[PDB]
Amino acid sequence: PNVSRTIARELKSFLLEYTDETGRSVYGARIRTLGEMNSESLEVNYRHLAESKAILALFLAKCPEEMLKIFDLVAMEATELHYPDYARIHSEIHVRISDFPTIYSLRELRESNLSSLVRVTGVVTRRTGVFPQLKYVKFNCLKCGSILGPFFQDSNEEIRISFCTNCKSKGPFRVNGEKTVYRNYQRVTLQEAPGTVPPGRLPRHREVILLADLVDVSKPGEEVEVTGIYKNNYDGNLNAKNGFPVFATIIEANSIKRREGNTANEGEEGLDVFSWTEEEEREFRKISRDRGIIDKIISSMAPSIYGHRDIKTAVACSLFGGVPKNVNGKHSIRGDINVLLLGDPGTAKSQILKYVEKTAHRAVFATGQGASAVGLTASVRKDPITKEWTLEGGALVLADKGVCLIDEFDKMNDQDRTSIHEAMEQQSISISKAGIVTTLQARCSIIAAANPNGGRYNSTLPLAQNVSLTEPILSRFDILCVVRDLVDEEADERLATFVVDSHVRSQLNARQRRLQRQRKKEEEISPIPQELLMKYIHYARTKIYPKLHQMDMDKVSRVYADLRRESISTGSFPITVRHLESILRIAESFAKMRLSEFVSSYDLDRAIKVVVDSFVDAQKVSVRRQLRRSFAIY
Amino acid sequence: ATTTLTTRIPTPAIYPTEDTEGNKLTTEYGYSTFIDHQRITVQEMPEMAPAGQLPRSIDVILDDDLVDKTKPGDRVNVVGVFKSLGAGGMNQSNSNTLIGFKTLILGN
Amino acid sequence: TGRGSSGVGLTAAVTTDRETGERRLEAGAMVLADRGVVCIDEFDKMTDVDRVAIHEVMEQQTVTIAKAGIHTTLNARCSVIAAANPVFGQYDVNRDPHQNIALPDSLL
Amino acid sequence: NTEIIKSFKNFILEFRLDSQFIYRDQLRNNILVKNYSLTVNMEHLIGYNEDIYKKLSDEPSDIIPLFETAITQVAKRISINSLPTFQLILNSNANQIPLRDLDSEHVSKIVRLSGIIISTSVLSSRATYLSIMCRNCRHTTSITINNFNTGNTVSLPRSCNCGPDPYIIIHESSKFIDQQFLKLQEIPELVPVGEMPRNLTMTCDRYLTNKVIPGTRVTIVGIYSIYNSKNSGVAIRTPYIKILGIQSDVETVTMFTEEEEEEFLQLSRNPKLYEILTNSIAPSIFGNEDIKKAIVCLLMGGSKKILPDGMRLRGDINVLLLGDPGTAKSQLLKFVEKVSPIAVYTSGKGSSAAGLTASVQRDPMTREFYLEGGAMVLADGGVVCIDEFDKMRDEDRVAIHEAMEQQTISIAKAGITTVLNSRTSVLAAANPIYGRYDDLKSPGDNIDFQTTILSRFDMIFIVKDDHNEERDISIANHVINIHTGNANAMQNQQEENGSEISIEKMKRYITYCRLKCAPRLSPQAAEKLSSNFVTIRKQLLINELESTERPITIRQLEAIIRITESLAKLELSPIAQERHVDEAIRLFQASTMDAAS
Amino acid sequence: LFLLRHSSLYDSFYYSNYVNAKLSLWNENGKKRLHKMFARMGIPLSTAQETWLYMDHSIKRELGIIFDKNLDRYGLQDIIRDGFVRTLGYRGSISASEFVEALTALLEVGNSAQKLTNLRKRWVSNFWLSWDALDDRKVELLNRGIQLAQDLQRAIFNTGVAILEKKLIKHLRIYRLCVLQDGPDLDLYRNPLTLLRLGNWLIECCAESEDKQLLPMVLASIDENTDTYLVAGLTPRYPRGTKKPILNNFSMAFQQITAETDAKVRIDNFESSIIEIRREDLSPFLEKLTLSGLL
Amino acid sequence: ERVFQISFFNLPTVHRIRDIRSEKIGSLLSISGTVTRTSEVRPELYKASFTCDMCRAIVDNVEQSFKYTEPTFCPNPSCENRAFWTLNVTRSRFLDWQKVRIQENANEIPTGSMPRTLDVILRGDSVERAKPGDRCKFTGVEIVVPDVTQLGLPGKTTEGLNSGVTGLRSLGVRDLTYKISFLACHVISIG
Ligand SMILES: Nc1ncnc2c1ncn2[C@@H]1O[C@H](COP(=O)(O)OP(=O)(O)OP(=O)(O)O)[C@@H](O)[C@H]1O
Ligand SMILES: Nc1ncnc2c1ncn2[C@@H]1O[C@H](COP(=O)(O)OP(=O)(O)OP(=O)(O)O)[C@@H](O)[C@H]1O
């Protein structure tokens, strides 16, 4: 009709005129910034999702898509006054929708659900590639005009007719070849991810038809969730079952987000919002020019563990990392830093590895049994009947910056350890079993939580007597962080009084008021909480690259080599050309957190006084003499 | 497609009945003549083909005079005419990415 | 070359449908061996499934097979030439001269 | 329209820079030796050719061959009939959007790709000039089908006054072009997040086919048009590239220009090649002089004798590197990969050693068993590189026993039994039983049971760990200069331009020097090595009586003669001498002693 | 924005930020702000031989109809210029703006007291291959300097951004002093023609308002033995408003310090704006300069 | 907005699956058994408003039977009938179902004699209530089902020997066979 023309006018002001949370113009910020990258996306803010939903929910479920087509043409004129001339540049925008209040999954889809907004999860299984789609059908008569305008074709329905508005004969509509733009089209079939499911049963299948600017966002194997509509278009021809009055479902998606974790939130961490422009970026500078930050940050990472310092420092260093630095026509340089935790059965080593999995951006958690040598890296899944022997990755090629686990699968130790110690040595490893000879790229990070046979001091005898590993696979790491406690009165209460208070930690204003309660409960000592702390990590890994000096580096060459001599003349396991490459690397990880690109003097001694003590303390009874050595190094 | 040279109008027929009369047609098979038909693929002599590829192959249609002469594993040397056959591009419509020119050797 | 896939003396019922309605027991490796010689290597570096095949073709001149088709006794006059290596280096003199490869004495 | 034709026949007979009259001066040179092809050059072609491409961008798929009809009409001017049509080859270079922007603004525009070609299909034929018969009315015509929208640009009509579709394809007066469907693969370095690479397809014309082997870097320029195969939702089609010209890098079949070999002969007379390469091969390797010399002789090789009898010798050498972790046996191996003409890198875990050499599978068409895959057949003429020779016991040893020492495999799987050629050269780098204990015990315990692989390789290095207090500090002084500061990248660029050799110069002269000269050693050396061996065996013979067993047998004695033939390929002298051969044993006499201690 | 007709609207992105280094930044806002005016068109591989050669005349017009509405509002008039051009009939259009740029860089690269002789024999020799650049006979050596030039700026900007972020510029009282004690790639600072350009980039980082102390800098660098230290001075600059007579004050002071003690000071280099110093003399150099106010 | 169904339950007599031939057509017979291999949830139609776009396609036609892809009865004006149809998604209510196989119980199997089975369609709110793996009872209406051989790509035993009599309908000469199947209305699981 015509009253929707006013509806577009009425919502447009209802969008841009208001910004929640003390102004600072939020909705005006999303638009101009995703103009500056030219990437065709918009959002819906959560606190005024629902107030933009309340007078529009009855105009959501009644019509979800034609409301969107008239929702789109106002966003052109929204930005057109702001940025002109988005016409010669791709001439096209379409909106997206943020998180929605709905829990349900694939098991619950009724006839009442269709032609409406739906949200559902799953795992992406085997997919196809990218094709072009016609999307603008210029129809062609034979006798009369062979140009009928670039049409508005549907989804997979093959819209055509016999004769209209030219004649009434059986001259079929054909094609010609000019000025028909093409979008792309990528059909991912979906399996239900076997997480929240009443177990012991089968998966179920659906179909997802993506759209133009949503191509190849996901990968074959992670878990995702979609925010699509529920269109049920088919003629009524089916051939695995007989013909019947039956219809098949097709979920046309509208947006996509990634693997989510710790599903307990109420008003945040449901979207990777990740826009740091006026208030956030001004703030992130003044949090970076302070004189105690790297002393404050590593104390602020693990919120709920009162342990010793160095393990937090190394696990701070691991997810920060250095540089996969380039080189000329010569050998490349490892840009990864890999740590190893040795512990006792009963300290908190199994939790810091758990906690870093949430705080990282992407991860995987292959632990314990079942870690097959083909299963971690790439494998070759066989073909169906008219198909070809293709290449399907496993763990590592997904996890670019993540976590594995090798503690002590004693039987399956000799199976896969010949596949992970060539992931670091021959860094970026891939293989050619019975197929193609390619090589993928995987600059992955390894942590591990190995376990000595019994107690932590199973001997005064050295580490080759203690662990069951041999030397070379052990020598790929940087440091063997080891734990210890026998008997201490004051140290035990410093854990014991600490741990019991953690168990004591068991509507628009109220949604805000619960948040301040959620903010105060983390702020007993206020150690810079996780609402902002993870958010600057992701651009501390993708925006800053450090560089070095020369005049301060050569002062540690004798500090290396004279410590190389005492460790070679007296050694359990030796340092080599390997360790010194980690010496300069974990130095510049620290200065990467000053956000500053340089390397100082204040850090190299800090980086040295992490490594040397954490090497020497694992030796023997004869450690009290070596502590008389290291203060000369300091 | 056996006269080896002239592309005549084919006869898409197996056997006719009822010539222009009211007589039930009879056929004398002793005075009807026959011939045989055998295809064989030939690999490459895998010593003089230089090391950049697997062996390739083509095929050859011969006649009765030298059948059963070719045991698999013989250094053979044939000579014949080079010949294409088959309709490429019209016998189906839209014909996209389908060769319709089979290499054949009708030789001796 | 003694690469010991199943096919050293058999067919494995490979027919390829032979133009829609013809099934052929395609000759693997004995139509070439007839009144000739063969040679194969690496006896102990083989699986079990070839060793059962070399049992039959030595006690009997013929193989006979019915895989998904026809029982057929086709004849073969073969003569193998062997090449294997001892296992434990230079251990022939300090131990028994027999069992020095310990492959089954069905062939020895 | 037409007349464009008059804008180009009046354009290529006079375009020149200052008094060289180039395009007639090469077309004349190209009609003579039969190639029938062109290229285009620079800017004004671009300068007004965009002013033609502003009327060619609308359809650069039908009026690209409207160039093609023109140059035949200038061709007959240089003749005075047997005249074929021509083809085009292009050139353009600004950058390389690898595989990202591929549906929006890139249908039928000129694209440039960088890829690694992996798979060739067998040839085929499509026609370009036909003759057509009406059936019962006997019309005769001829249609030419030049450029494409894959098949069916135009069809055959119904009008001859005879019946419907009366048209047939004779084969008496016909020409043919060949296509490929070779497959292209993304260069595996440009888009890393977590993804797997994808692949496209392309065809070509005959006077640019068979110009690529699988396993090379390549660049390519062409169109992004779309076909539609009817062997999946709405009427969707597929992508493919129509290529035009491969202005590749080198082949990496020995034809090239002459100024390349001029400097090579000017370098080869300066007799400092043997010592200057060891500094200039690996600009990132502290010393290691005994190992470094083994690599340059491995890359070039010896010869091959098909001497007037039946048998043959094997002209190749194969080295090993076993030692402690942290002695750069790994990262040295990536360094030989880029410098080789043909190299693969399958260095890990064997990768199903039965499926290393051959694979057969069922087929989508005709359900057949043919040969497809292999790691060796791809890698002929060059060098492979593998590792981990401790924890592979399954099939890795039973797959290389035949693949080495005679280099003549034949697969006896369900289809064929064919002896395909092989002239490969292997390389490996394993670990002993955690290194130190094999250098602190009886000298056994290297391979778990068998030494029979160890007799099949000749050259073996056994590195170790010293503690010399002056050589480490230099190394600790070395690697900080190469890590950060990149000052030796400014230093080695300063000793490059008069003294050293970069990477792109080493590759090009190795394929030249191997494929030209053919050495032979002098009979004066025959007394030299014979007197050498009898005490070498005796030095072994005095060791066995002391109850010391293990391994030396006679393959090494016929391996030293390939080693002394190797530097004769380096100097490109058709003989071999005594200061030649005394330095050669000086490499191997050094590796005889470590076979004992 | 230079060398456009020869090439690289890509590496214009650096020296567009040079022009925004003339405005109020060196990296921060521009690496957002450039992305309104630039990546509007993705910059191709084949037709970019035609689009930023030919139909950038649709876009030079478009900047011509962008900056006319950036004229009464922005008013930054360092971009539109009259200039001059020439052509050769064919072989592209080459103006004289970019042409002087190739001649500078090609003069630079293109190659006791025992090192200075083998350093002085270089600069005469590489001079010589620039003098014959004025024929048509040099074509495939003409582009050699061109591809040399668009890395040298990428080389020189690589360290200019370093010495900013080090924050070692100190306004003591009169001037600002900076001593590049050590960084990477020190070799490209022996030949003095690069140094005035480094100052030419460095005089424009301080070309903001600065409504007091319009005094240029004095830098310092060393590559070779005995601390040669080819120290130099610059000129102050005007933001297109010379009314005051500002030539130089340093050469008057350069006569003074050279007249004092002759304790290994040298003026053997030709231009008076460059001298040498010893390492233990640069610190009593400035103490003689912070009191001798001769402006 | 109102759509109903009729749910009987608790007839006295409970049979087994081997007792269903002659009198059991159109009857009501409670049946026990155990269930295996469910399937998914798709929608059905039972009524449409599709019509041809000849003049006006707003004819709510009838007879959504087992071959219901042709609404061709009583067009609106004097127009062209059975010329088209447009099954809109906007006006015809649907109902959701799943197809399951059952199997005979373990305390009745005489010998190991390849225990036979049959299939059953459940169509109301009965959807996703038969959890696979329990001794279950059912409603009871028995039903036959054909295949009409629609416009799709296709059109040992002497099956359809009955169907050779079923030739010569007004549409094309073929053989329409049959198979006994089951329609339910109401589930229970005592056990
Ligand atoms: N210092 C500590 N602070 C808080 N909680 C702790 C501490 N040490 C242990 N715990 C608690 O003890 C529980 C037992 O897990 P624990 O970390 O001991 O496993 P683990 O011994 O590390 O396992 P694994 O040996 O497999 O790594 C944890 O859930 C953790 O909450
Ligand atoms: N002799 C050497 N000269 C220069 N660099 C060396 C040398 N030996 C080792 N390196 C350096 O070691 C660095 C990392 O190599 P890496 O530690 O992976 O060796 P590795 O693979 O552990 O040795 P191995 O193969 O014996 O296990 C490389 O950057 C390389 O430059």
Residue numbers in the entry:
A (entry chain h): 201 to 706, 737 to 864
B (entry chain i): 217 to 324
C (entry chain i): 433 to 540
D (entry chain k): 24 to 103, 130 to 198, 201 to 211, 235 to 305, 319 to 339, 346 to 643, 647 to 693
E (entry chain e): 326 to 436, 462 to 591, 597 to 650
F (entry chain l): 260 to 414, 428 to 463
Paper text:
Replication in eukaryotes utilizes CMG helicase (Cdc45−Mcm2-7−GINS), leading and lagging strand DNA polymerases (Pol) ε and δ, Pol α-primase, PCNA clamps, the RFC clamp loader, and numerous accessory factors of less defined function. Ctf4 (Chromosome Transmission Fidelity 4) is a homo-trimer (Ctf43) that connects Pol α-primase and CMG helicase. The structures of the C-half of Ctf4 and its human orthologue AND1 reveal a disc-shaped constitutive trimer via the β-propeller domains on the N-terminal face (N-face) with the three C-terminal helical domains interacting with up to three CIP peptides on the C-face. We sought to address these questions by a combination of biochemistry and cryo-EM and found that one Ctf43 binds CMG very tight, not dynamic, and can bind 1, 2, or 3 CMG holoenzymes without steric hinderance at a 120° angle to one another.
Density scans of fractions within the SEC elution profile indicated a heterogeneous mixture of CMG–Ctf43 complexes, with CMG:Ctf43 ratios ranging from 3:1 to 1:1. We therefore examined different fractions by cryo-EM and found that indeed, more than one CMG can bind Ctf43. Therefore, one Ctf43 may organize up to three CMGs. Indeed, we observed 2D class averages that show two or three CMGs per Ctf43, related by the three-fold axis of Ctf43. The current report demonstrates that two (or three) CMG can bind Ctf4 tightly, that CMGs bound to the Ctf4 trimer retain activity, and that a complex of 2(CMG–Pol ε)–1Ctf43–1Pol α-primase spontaneously assembles in vitro.
